[PDB]
Write an enzyme that holds these catalytic residues in place. Structure first.
Site, PDB file in Angstrom:
ATOM      1  N   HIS A 166       2.754  19.859 -40.734  1.00 55.91           N
ATOM      2  CA  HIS A 166       2.589  18.709 -39.859  1.00 55.91           C
ATOM      3  C   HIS A 166       3.572  17.593 -40.204  1.00 55.91           C
TER       4      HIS A 166
ATOM      5  N   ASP B  58      30.741   8.656 -21.812  1.00 64.01           N
ATOM      6  CA  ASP B  58      30.085   9.707 -22.576  1.00 64.01           C
ATOM      7  C   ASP B  58      30.247   9.361 -24.050  1.00 64.01           C
TER       8      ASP B  58
ATOM      9  N   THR C 101      11.389  -8.718 -40.596  1.00 64.92           N
ATOM     10  CA  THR C 101      10.490  -8.055 -39.660  1.00 64.92           C
ATOM     11  C   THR C 101       9.600  -9.067 -38.950  1.00 64.92           C
TER      12      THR C 101
HETATM   13  C1  HEA Z   1       7.626   3.824 -39.171  1.00 59.48           C
HETATM   14  C2  HEA Z   1       7.714   4.199 -40.436  1.00 59.48           C
HETATM   15  C3  HEA Z   1       7.358   3.261 -41.526  1.00 59.48           C
HETATM   16  C4  HEA Z   1       7.645   1.828 -41.563  1.00 59.48           C
HETATM   17  C5  HEA Z   1       8.326   0.934 -40.560  1.00 59.48           C
HETATM   18  C6  HEA Z   1       7.073   1.463 -42.882  1.00 59.48           C
HETATM   19  C7  HEA Z   1       7.103   0.067 -43.333  1.00 59.48           C
HETATM   20  C8  HEA Z   1       6.699  -0.480 -44.638  1.00 59.48           C
HETATM   21  N1  HEA Z   1       6.110   0.275 -45.586  1.00 59.48           N
HETATM   22 FE1  HEA Z   1       5.617   2.337 -45.505  1.00 59.48          FE
HETATM   23  N2  HEA Z   1       5.301   4.417 -45.483  1.00 59.48           N
HETATM   24  C9  HEA Z   1       5.616   5.299 -44.510  1.00 59.48           C
HETATM   25  C10 HEA Z   1       6.222   4.896 -43.223  1.00 59.48           C
HETATM   26  C11 HEA Z   1       6.686   3.559 -42.822  1.00 59.48           C
HETATM   27  N3  HEA Z   1       6.515   2.468 -43.600  1.00 59.48           N
HETATM   28  C12 HEA Z   1       5.294   6.719 -44.831  1.00 59.48           C
HETATM   29  C13 HEA Z   1       5.502   7.941 -43.998  1.00 59.48           C
HETATM   30  C14 HEA Z   1       4.709   6.640 -46.175  1.00 59.48           C
HETATM   31  C15 HEA Z   1       4.152   7.726 -47.068  1.00 59.48           C
HETATM   32  C16 HEA Z   1       5.211   8.711 -47.530  1.00 59.48           C
HETATM   33  C17 HEA Z   1       4.464   9.814 -48.227  1.00 59.48           C
HETATM   34  O1  HEA Z   1       4.090   9.620 -49.412  1.00 59.48           O
HETATM   35  O2  HEA Z   1       4.241  10.864 -47.574  1.00 59.48           O
HETATM   36  C18 HEA Z   1       4.788   5.201 -46.464  1.00 59.48           C
HETATM   37  C19 HEA Z   1       4.282   4.675 -47.735  1.00 59.48           C
HETATM   38  C20 HEA Z   1       4.590   3.341 -48.233  1.00 59.48           C
HETATM   39  C21 HEA Z   1       4.518   2.982 -49.674  1.00 59.48           C
HETATM   40  C22 HEA Z   1       4.211   3.868 -50.858  1.00 59.48           C
HETATM   41  C23 HEA Z   1       2.685   3.770 -51.039  1.00 59.48           C
HETATM   42  C24 HEA Z   1       2.137   4.874 -51.938  1.00 59.48           C
HETATM   43  O3  HEA Z   1       2.562   6.046 -51.792  1.00 59.48           O
HETATM   44  O4  HEA Z   1       1.276   4.583 -52.807  1.00 59.48           O
HETATM   45  C25 HEA Z   1       4.832   1.544 -49.685  1.00 59.48           C
HETATM   46  C26 HEA Z   1       4.941   0.719 -50.910  1.00 59.48           C
HETATM   47  O5  HEA Z   1       4.962  -0.501 -50.839  1.00 59.48           O
HETATM   48  C27 HEA Z   1       5.091   1.120 -48.287  1.00 59.48           C
HETATM   49  C28 HEA Z   1       5.339  -0.258 -47.877  1.00 59.48           C
HETATM   50  C29 HEA Z   1       5.937  -0.622 -46.594  1.00 59.48           C
HETATM   51  C30 HEA Z   1       6.379  -2.015 -46.341  1.00 59.48           C
HETATM   52  C31 HEA Z   1       6.316  -3.231 -47.225  1.00 59.48           C
HETATM   53  C32 HEA Z   1       6.904  -1.921 -44.983  1.00 59.48           C
HETATM   54  C33 HEA Z   1       7.507  -3.019 -44.199  1.00 59.48           C
HETATM   55  O6  HEA Z   1       8.680  -2.471 -43.603  1.00 59.48           O
HETATM   56  C34 HEA Z   1       6.516  -3.549 -43.169  1.00 59.48           C
HETATM   57  C35 HEA Z   1       6.844  -4.996 -42.781  1.00 59.48           C
HETATM   58  C36 HEA Z   1       6.054  -5.420 -41.556  1.00 59.48           C
HETATM   59  C37 HEA Z   1       5.115  -6.387 -41.620  1.00 59.48           C
HETATM   60  C38 HEA Z   1       4.808  -7.097 -42.909  1.00 59.48           C
HETATM   61  C39 HEA Z   1       4.354  -6.774 -40.378  1.00 59.48           C
HETATM   62  C40 HEA Z   1       5.128  -7.797 -39.526  1.00 59.48           C
HETATM   63  C41 HEA Z   1       5.466  -9.071 -40.280  1.00 59.48           C
HETATM   64  C42 HEA Z   1       4.888 -10.262 -40.025  1.00 59.48           C
HETATM   65  C43 HEA Z   1       3.853 -10.396 -38.950  1.00 59.48           C
HETATM   66  C44 HEA Z   1       5.301 -11.476 -40.834  1.00 59.48           C
HETATM   67  C45 HEA Z   1       4.152 -12.022 -41.674  1.00 59.48           C
HETATM   68  C46 HEA Z   1       3.636 -11.006 -42.679  1.00 59.48           C
HETATM   69  C47 HEA Z   1       3.546 -11.269 -43.997  1.00 59.48           C
HETATM   70  C48 HEA Z   1       3.987 -12.591 -44.560  1.00 59.48           C
HETATM   71  C49 HEA Z   1       3.013 -10.215 -44.930  1.00 59.48           C
HETATM   72  N4  HEA Z   1       4.789   2.193 -47.329  1.00 59.48           N
HETATM   73  C1  HEA Z   2       5.674  10.534 -36.669  1.00 54.04           C
HETATM   74  C2  HEA Z   2       4.913  10.749 -37.718  1.00 54.04           C
HETATM   75  C3  HEA Z   2       3.496  11.182 -37.576  1.00 54.04           C
HETATM   76  C4  HEA Z   2       2.635  11.253 -36.388  1.00 54.04           C
HETATM   77  C5  HEA Z   2       2.880  10.897 -34.942  1.00 54.04           C
HETATM   78  C6  HEA Z   2       1.376  11.750 -36.998  1.00 54.04           C
HETATM   79  C7  HEA Z   2       0.188  12.015 -36.186  1.00 54.04           C
HETATM   80  C8  HEA Z   2      -1.155  12.380 -36.638  1.00 54.04           C
HETATM   81  N1  HEA Z   2      -1.464  12.640 -37.918  1.00 54.04           N
HETATM   82 FE1  HEA Z   2      -0.168  12.657 -39.562  1.00 54.04          FE
HETATM   83  N2  HEA Z   2       1.183  12.703 -41.188  1.00 54.04           N
HETATM   84  C9  HEA Z   2       2.485  12.348 -41.213  1.00 54.04           C
HETATM   85  C10 HEA Z   2       3.163  11.763 -40.056  1.00 54.04           C
HETATM   86  C11 HEA Z   2       2.649  11.645 -38.689  1.00 54.04           C
HETATM   87  N3  HEA Z   2       1.397  11.981 -38.333  1.00 54.04           N
HETATM   88  C12 HEA Z   2       3.182  12.520 -42.518  1.00 54.04           C
HETATM   89  C13 HEA Z   2       4.607  12.208 -42.892  1.00 54.04           C
HETATM   90  C14 HEA Z   2       2.117  13.065 -43.376  1.00 54.04           C
HETATM   91  C15 HEA Z   2       2.174  13.469 -44.824  1.00 54.04           C
HETATM   92  C16 HEA Z   2       2.131  14.979 -44.976  1.00 54.04           C
HETATM   93  C17 HEA Z   2       2.001  15.242 -46.469  1.00 54.04           C
HETATM   94  O1  HEA Z   2       1.005  14.786 -47.079  1.00 54.04           O
HETATM   95  O2  HEA Z   2       2.903  15.883 -47.052  1.00 54.04           O
HETATM   96  C18 HEA Z   2       0.967  13.131 -42.452  1.00 54.04           C
HETATM   97  C19 HEA Z   2      -0.328  13.622 -42.900  1.00 54.04           C
HETATM   98  C20 HEA Z   2      -1.578  13.424 -42.162  1.00 54.04           C
HETATM   99  C21 HEA Z   2      -2.926  13.385 -42.798  1.00 54.04           C
HETATM  100  C22 HEA Z   2      -3.303  13.438 -44.264  1.00 54.04           C
HETATM  101  C23 HEA Z   2      -3.395  14.923 -44.650  1.00 54.04           C
HETATM  102  C24 HEA Z   2      -3.812  15.102 -46.099  1.00 54.04           C
HETATM  103  O3  HEA Z   2      -3.520  14.217 -46.929  1.00 54.04           O
HETATM  104  O4  HEA Z   2      -4.446  16.138 -46.417  1.00 54.04           O
HETATM  105  C25 HEA Z   2      -3.839  13.292 -41.655  1.00 54.04           C
HETATM  106  C26 HEA Z   2      -5.312  13.187 -41.764  1.00 54.04           C
HETATM  107  O5  HEA Z   2      -5.999  13.343 -40.770  1.00 54.04           O
HETATM  108  C27 HEA Z   2      -3.028  13.254 -40.415  1.00 54.04           C
HETATM  109  C28 HEA Z   2      -3.566  13.227 -39.061  1.00 54.04           C
HETATM  110  C29 HEA Z   2      -2.782  12.897 -37.869  1.00 54.04           C
HETATM  111  C30 HEA Z   2      -3.412  12.822 -36.536  1.00 54.04           C
HETATM  112  C31 HEA Z   2      -4.865  13.066 -36.222  1.00 54.04           C
HETATM  113  C32 HEA Z   2      -2.270  12.456 -35.680  1.00 54.04           C
HETATM  114  C33 HEA Z   2      -2.179  12.259 -34.218  1.00 54.04           C
HETATM  115  O6  HEA Z   2      -2.964  13.335 -33.693  1.00 54.04           O
HETATM  116  C34 HEA Z   2      -2.605  10.882 -33.699  1.00 54.04           C
HETATM  117  C35 HEA Z   2      -2.464  10.777 -32.177  1.00 54.04           C
HETATM  118  C36 HEA Z   2      -1.040  10.907 -31.672  1.00 54.04           C
HETATM  119  C37 HEA Z   2      -0.790  11.567 -30.524  1.00 54.04           C
HETATM  120  C38 HEA Z   2      -1.919  12.164 -29.741  1.00 54.04           C
HETATM  121  C39 HEA Z   2       0.596  11.741 -29.946  1.00 54.04           C
HETATM  122  C40 HEA Z   2       1.720  11.389 -30.892  1.00 54.04           C
HETATM  123  C41 HEA Z   2       3.042  11.334 -30.136  1.00 54.04           C
HETATM  124  C42 HEA Z   2       4.162  11.959 -30.559  1.00 54.04           C
HETATM  125  C43 HEA Z   2       4.125  12.737 -31.848  1.00 54.04           C
HETATM  126  C44 HEA Z   2       5.448  11.819 -29.774  1.00 54.04           C
HETATM  127  C45 HEA Z   2       6.129  13.107 -29.310  1.00 54.04           C
HETATM  128  C46 HEA Z   2       6.008  13.046 -27.816  1.00 54.04           C
HETATM  129  C47 HEA Z   2       6.958  12.808 -26.896  1.00 54.04           C
HETATM  130  C48 HEA Z   2       8.408  12.555 -27.164  1.00 54.04           C
HETATM  131  C49 HEA Z   2       6.457  12.804 -25.505  1.00 54.04           C
HETATM  132  N4  HEA Z   2      -1.603  13.469 -40.684  1.00 54.04           N
END
Ligand code: HEA
Ligand code: HEA
Ligand code: DMU
Ligand code: DMU
Ligand code: DMU
Ligand code: DMU
Ligand code: DMU
Ligand code: DMU
Ligand SMILES: OC[C@H]1O[C@H](O[C@H]2[C@H](O)[C@@H](O)[C@@H](O)O[C@@H]2CO)[C@H](O)[C@@H](O)[C@@H]1O
Ligand code: TRD
Ligand code: TRD
Ligand code: TRD
Ligand code: TRD
Ligand code: TRD
Ligand code: TRD
Ligand code: TRD
Ligand code: TRD
Ligand code: TRD
Ligand code: TRD
Ligand code: HTH
Ligand code: HTH
Ligand code: CA
Ligand code: CU
Ligand code: CU
Ligand code: CU
Ligand code: MG
Ligand code: OH
Lengths: 535, 256
Positions: free
Chosen positions: A86, A116, A343
């Site tokens: 997944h 293009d 952000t």
């Molecule tokens: C779309 C993808 C996406 C985006 C954009 C982000 C954005 C951010 N992520 Fe995330 N993150 C993931 C996808 C993403 N992450 C995934 C997939 C994992 C798990 C990977 C794995 O282990 O499988 C992960 C895990 C992850 C970790 C590791 C946690 C752990 O494994 O224990 C951390 C650590 O700090 C982190 C922090 C952040 C922070 C600080 C932002 C910042 O970019 C967010 C900033 C945005 C805001 C803060 C909101 C808007 C801001 C305001 C409204 C201003 C006012 C707010 C304040 C003053 C706070 N995320």
């Molecule tokens: C894009 C990133 C993405 C998206 C969309 C999702 C979607 C969902 N995921 Fe997650 N998930 C991950 C990224 C994402 N996930 C990652 C990185 C991990 C870590 C794996 C690991 O541990 O190694 C993870 C693992 C993860 C866990 C933890 C598993 C575990 O620790 O054992 C669970 C638990 O329920 C979960 C559930 C779901 C469900 C219910 C939805 C969805 O069903 C929610 C509803 C969304 C939809 C119904 C549609 C979504 C739309 C699209 C995907 C766009 C494509 C379509 C067009 C272009 C038309 N996923």
């Protein structure tokens, strides 16, 4: 005919990316339905070892009906293969191909007045590398793998030594799959950057480029630095597995933690590669339906550049419990916090764009408004996790899972849907029915929130990631989270119905610009669909 | 002994705290939670107000402004100040967490596929810990009448299945426990939520954590780095007891 697949025109490659990403997205969402069936109740009822003794297809259908615990021998390997599959599909073969390969290839040239991409045949090759990678990823699910079964149960980031010890060659197929996906992304980035710099229309100065094109441009740079690093990291996995190296094996002087630095050096940029084009789409959509020019165009550009750059010096916040020293832990926590300021500027400027406008609540605007609220929920829990002192408790719990599903599946995915409803008329010549787009939005808004908000509670109560089964006390919020995922799935099947209805019998589009004058970029000055050969 | 460190049905908060470090985490998280809930509510109320106040039927000619410099200076500096406040409270907590004090008790923990090995180097005690219900105890990682019987005999109930182990790591209350964590085959991760500790068990590396338990009882953790097929089935039981109950346990292990 297969004249679609050999096309080299950016519009046709964009459509192939969109559809393929959508199909792969359907497969990966189906995996999560099965995941949430098993997580709906404590005890294992679906993923039984007994189902292995039957055949592939027969064991498949037995897997979808619950068994009593006493007749179900827990098979944690199948759980680990499902969640690994997944995550690999989502992070490499769904959302970036849809936003970057899809909307990027289609609309970035239109937005800059280019006919293009600079290298159309390179663009067509990039799509086939994506399909080759997707096919290896899926093939690995059926290849001999860990524990004398099929598939790789090692998580989507492939930590060693688990990934280098997993038996079979399923993991090697997964690594090759990630190679092909990075190759596809690197070719796309080269095309975006060359086209952006060299083929803008006369008069299109860089401070006149639309925000979406900027976001693709910045994203293309992040790809060029992040993905080669990933190719290194995973080739070292391949040579430890197959060619007697010891990069990550302590017996031979290796260090498994070295792999984590290399991988997360790609791994955090990866999520800003995911979300930056969604930021670009939100800017175009919100400007159009607020009927108001975007607030702070130049801060918007610079904030995306600031986010892209900071995204390269924060990676070790994925490693607070992996043995980082106190000095590294304190640096990476402080560098990570900075990302909130650019952000926040974009969030506040999107609200400022709405402010004083004339707001039309049509389906693309619903998705963009949902993005603002839900991305903020995900972003502030990212800031929580940035505090290493609190990440001590939350790391490897479902609080992390809640965080990244809010920014990805209620953030970036809302940007994908906002783009589809925004542009399907422009791409296809047919319009979606407004009531169904709204119903899709509200079904997804309710279901996705029911799915992932309770996972904050599970994380706070200590539920670990990657578990086939869980102690009895976690049952209530796991149950609610599975009901939300089933509703979310219903909303997505309905969406596929809406797309099928739109493309076969949707209302005919007659206007070049079927929205309003504040959709003011060049694609709204062309026909719907634009002519086969542009500018 | 009271079962304290455990998830509770329908819980939305932290597991109960039993160490000063866990208390710090609960406070820091509650402080940040009020802030980020304020930010989120603020952002949400702004969007709902703007949609209500500036709906096209209520505001029919849109404005055209794209700047407001007092506001942009405000909404750049106030986040920076909010974050500096958070960092000011959270860096001490991080420093208290990661500075290892002097040990009263020292335990060396090794993670295996799929169980934990404990050694008390001062006491020449070592043993392994398997989930009640694992193959080691006769099960296959599922509930059954036999597994429920074993849980009762070990002093638990069927509700502690997947958390309770056949042997426990026993430590004295109000003493500084230093745990040295390593992995034997793949990476595992050793944690006890009620103590606010978690440390990856990496082959080839020895990493340290500390806790001082402030009350007696039973506290559970679960392995927290995906390690293979029984990742879900290799938990941690810690029993915090009185100084002499601890000595009693030590003496029962001494070979004459
Ligand atoms: C779309 C993808 C996406 C985006 C954009 C982000 C954005 C951010 N992520 Fe995330 N993150 C993931 C996808 C993403 N992450 C995934 C997939 C994992 C798990 C990977 C794995 O282990 O499988 C992960 C895990 C992850 C970790 C590791 C946690 C752990 O494994 O224990 C951390 C650590 O700090 C982190 C922090 C952040 C922070 C600080 C932002 C910042 O970019 C967010 C900033 C945005 C805001 C803060 C909101 C808007 C801001 C305001 C409204 C201003 C006012 C707010 C304040 C003053 C706070 N995320
Ligand atoms: C894009 C990133 C993405 C998206 C969309 C999702 C979607 C969902 N995921 Fe997650 N998930 C991950 C990224 C994402 N996930 C990652 C990185 C991990 C870590 C794996 C690991 O541990 O190694 C993870 C693992 C993860 C866990 C933890 C598993 C575990 O620790 O054992 C669970 C638990 O329920 C979960 C559930 C779901 C469900 C219910 C939805 C969805 O069903 C929610 C509803 C969304 C939809 C119904 C549609 C979504 C739309 C699209 C995907 C766009 C494509 C379509 C067009 C272009 C038309 N996923
Ligand atoms: C829009 C399309 C989406 C498709 C979603 C498909 C949803 C399918 C729901 C599965 O049905 C339930 O599965 C539970 C297993 O998790 C069973 O739990 C019950 O039965 C088990 C025995 O198998 C016991 O062990 C459980 O404790 C007990 O709660 C329960 O009987 C059964 O009704
Ligand atoms: C947090 C996000 C909340 C968004 C707040 C929106 C900012 O408020 C508006 O900003 C404008 C400043 O750009 C002001 O216009 C003022 O300045 C304009 C010049 O740009 C004039 O045309 C206007 O008449 C004059 O009222 C206007 O009064 C004020 O309400
Ligand atoms: C889950 C997936 C998400 C869905 C993504 C949105 C779908 C994108 C639009 C579909 O593709 C369009 O279909 C049109 C069909 O009308 C084509 O018009 C074409 O029609 C003729 C052939 O039908 C051609 O000769 C013309 O060049 C051309 O105008 C057009 O080229 C093509 O791009
Ligand atoms: C597998 C997932 C299953 C998801 C289940 C989805 C259920 C769909 C409900 C079908 O009912 C529809 O409701 C629409 C809205 O009320 C009607 O549009 C009608 O009402 C609209 C006004 O809101 C008008 O714009 C339309 O022209 C008019 O046809 C439409 O006729 C009717 O068929
Ligand atoms: C797996 C789940 C699959 C579910 C797929 C459902 C999504 C497709 C929705 C189709 O709804 C159509 O919407 C039109 C509204 O846009 C309606 O036209 C109605 O509304 C128009 C007025 O706007 C009239 O001109 C038409 O004659 C009148 O039929 C039409 O009846 C209705 O069927
Ligand atoms: C080609 C490769 C495979 C493609 C995969 C996509 C398959 C999805 C098929 C969905 O087609 C739709 O099915 C609905 C019926 O099941 C119809 O809505 C009908 O039913 C809805 C719900 O009642 C109503 O709202 C509508 O008015 C009414 O048109 C709708 O017209 C029709 O187009
Ligand atoms: O828990 C309080 C903490 O205070 C001190 O830590 C300081 C450190 O000395 C400074 O360099 C500062 O920049 O970081 C920390 C801020 O709390 C003590 O050194 C430390 O032992 C003590 O735990
Ligand atoms: C129709 C293929 C998509 C996958 C559906 C998800 C269900 C997966 C069942 C796994 C059965 C184990 C062999
Ligand atoms: C009381 C016997 C079991 C009844 C519940 C069976 C639910 C099966 C749902 C299957 C879902 C397939 C996707
Ligand atoms: C032939 C063994 C594989 C070599 C892959 C690249 C090794 C260089 C490591 C660079 C460190 C991160 C860029
Ligand atoms: C977080 C998104 C909320 C957007 C508010 C939607 C209000 C819609 C009211 C009905 C409008 C006509 C269908
Ligand atoms: C013209 C009527 C407005 C169309 C609204 C369609 C969606 C209504 C809300 C549905 C809520 C579903 C949970
Ligand atoms: C105690 C057995 C619980 C069975 C609950 C199954 C509910 C299925 C929900 C499907 C809803 C789809 C929208
Ligand atoms: C204990 C909480 C019951 C379920 C709440 C549903 C919303
Ligand atoms: C602003 C999003 C934060 C989501 C975290 C939810 C925490 C729930 C707090 C409940 C605490 C119970 C004591
Ligand atoms: C804003 C923080 C609220 C206070 C958190 C509650 C503290 C939990 C542990 C305190 C028990 C001390 C023995
Ligand atoms: C090798 C023995 C490890 C400990 C097994 C269970 C602990 C026994 C309880 C100690 C005193 C409790 C009051
Ligand atoms: C915005 C930068 C945040 C840094 C801050 O949290 C701490 O370093 C202040 O002590
Ligand atoms: C309380 C009994 C202490 C006995 C002590 O000598 C042993 O732990 C040493 O092996
Ligand atoms: Ca289950
Ligand atoms: Cu990151
Ligand atoms: Cu383990
Ligand atoms: Cu594990
Ligand atoms: Mg970990
Ligand atoms: O990340």
């Amino acid at each position: 005919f297969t004249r679609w697949f050999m096309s080299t025109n950016h519009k046709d490659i964009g459509v192939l990316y969109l559809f393929t990403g959508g199909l792969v997205g359907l497969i990966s969402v189906a995996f999560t339905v099965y995941m949430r069936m098993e997580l709906m109740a404590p005890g294992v009822q679906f993923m039984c070892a007994e189902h292995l003794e039957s055949g592939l297809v027969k064991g498949f259908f037995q897997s979808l009906w619950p068994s009593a615990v006493e007749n179900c021998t827990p098979n944690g390997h199948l759980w680990n293969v499902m969640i690994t599959g997944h995550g690999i599909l989502m992070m490499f073969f769904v959302v970036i191909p849809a936003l970057f390969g899809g909307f990027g290839n289609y609309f970035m040239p239109l937005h800059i007045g280019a006919p293009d991409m600079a290298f159309p045949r390179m663009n067509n090759l990039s799509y086939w590398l994506y399909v080759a990678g997707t096919s290896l990823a899926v093939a690995s699910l059926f290849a001999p793998g860990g524990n004398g079964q099929l598939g790789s149960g090692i998580g989507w980031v492939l930590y060693p030594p688990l990934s280098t010890s997993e038996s079979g060659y399923s993991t090697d197929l997964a690594i090759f799959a990630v190679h092909l996906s990075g190759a596809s992304s690197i070719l796309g980035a080269i095309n975006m950057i060359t086209t952006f710099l060299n083929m803008r229309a006369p008069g299109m100065t860089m401070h006149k480029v639309p925000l979406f094109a900027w976001s693709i441009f910045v994203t293309a740079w992040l790809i060029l630095l992040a993905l080669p690093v990933l190719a290194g990291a995973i080739t070292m996995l391949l040579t430890d597995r197959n060619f007697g190296t010891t990069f990550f094996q302590p017996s031979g002087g290796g260090d498994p933690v070295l792999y984590q630095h290399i991988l997360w050096f790609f791994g955090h940029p990866e999520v800003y590669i995911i979300v930056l084009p969604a930021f670009g789409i939100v800017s175009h959509v919100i400007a159009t339906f607020a009927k108001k020019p975007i607030f702070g165009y130049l801060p918007m550009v610079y904030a995306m550049v600031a986010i892209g750059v900071l995204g390269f010096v924060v990676w070790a916040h994925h490693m607070y419990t992996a043995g980082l020293s106190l000095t590294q832990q304190s640096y990476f926590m402080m560098a990570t916090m900075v990302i909130a300021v650019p952000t926040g500027i974009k969030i506040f400027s999107w609200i400022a764009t709405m402010w004083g406008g004339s707001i039309e609540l049509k389906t693309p605007m619903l998705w963009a408004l949902g993005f603002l609220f839900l991305f903020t929920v995900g972003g502030v829990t990212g800031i929580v996790l940035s505090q290493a002192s609190v990440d001590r408790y939350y790391h490897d719990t479902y609080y992390v899972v809640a965080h990244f599903h809010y920014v990805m599946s209620l953030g970036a995915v809302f940007g994908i849907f906002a783009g589809i409803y925004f542009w399907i008329g422009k791409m296809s010549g047919r319009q979606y029915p407004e009531w169904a787009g709204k119903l899709h939005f509200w079904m997804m808004f309710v279901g996705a929130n029911l799915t992932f908000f309770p996972q904050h509670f599970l994380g706070r109560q200590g539920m670990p990631r990657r578990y086939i089964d869980y102690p009895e006390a976690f049952a209530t919020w796991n149950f609610v989270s599975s009901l939300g995922a089933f509703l979310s799935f219903a909303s997505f099947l309905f969406f596929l119905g809406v797309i099928f209805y739109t493309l076969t019998r949707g209302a005919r589009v007659t206007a070049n610009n079927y929205w309003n004058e504040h959709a003011d970029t060049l694609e709204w000055t062309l026909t719907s669909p634009p002519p086969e050969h542009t500018f | 002994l009271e079962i304290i460190g455990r998830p509770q049905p329908g819980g939305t908060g932290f597991q109960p705290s039993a160490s000063p470090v866990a208390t710090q985490i609960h406070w820091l998280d509650g402080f940040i939670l009020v802030i980020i809930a304020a930010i989120t509510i603020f952002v949400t109320l702004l969007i709902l107000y703007a949609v209500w106040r500036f709906h096209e039927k209520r505001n029919k000619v849109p404005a055209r402004f794209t700047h407001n410099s007092p506001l942009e200076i405000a909404w750049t500096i106030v986040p920076i100040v909010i974050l500096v406040a958070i960092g000011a409270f959270s860096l001490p907590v991080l420093f208290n967490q990661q500075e290892i004090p002097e040990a009263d008790v020292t335990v060396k923990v090794t993670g295996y596929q799929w169980y934990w090995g404990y050694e008390y180097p001062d006491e020449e005690i070592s043993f392994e810990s398997y989930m009640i219900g694992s193959p080691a105890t006769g099960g296959d990682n599922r509930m059954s009448p036999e597994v429920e019987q074993q849980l009762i005999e070990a002093g638990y109930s069927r509700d502690e299945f997947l958390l309770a182990t056949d042997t426990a790591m026993v430590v004295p209350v109000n003493k500084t426990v230093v745990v040295q964590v390593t992995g034997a085959d793949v990476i595992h991760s050793w944690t006890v939520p009620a103590f606010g500790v978690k440390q990856d068990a990496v082959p080839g590396r020895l990493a340290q954590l500390w806790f001082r338990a402030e009350r007696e009882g039973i506290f559970f953790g679960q392995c927290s780095e995906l390690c293979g097929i029984s990742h879900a089935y290799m938990p941690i039981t810690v029993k915090v007891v009185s100084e002499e109950a601890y000595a009693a346990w030590l003496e029962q292990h001494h070979h004459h």
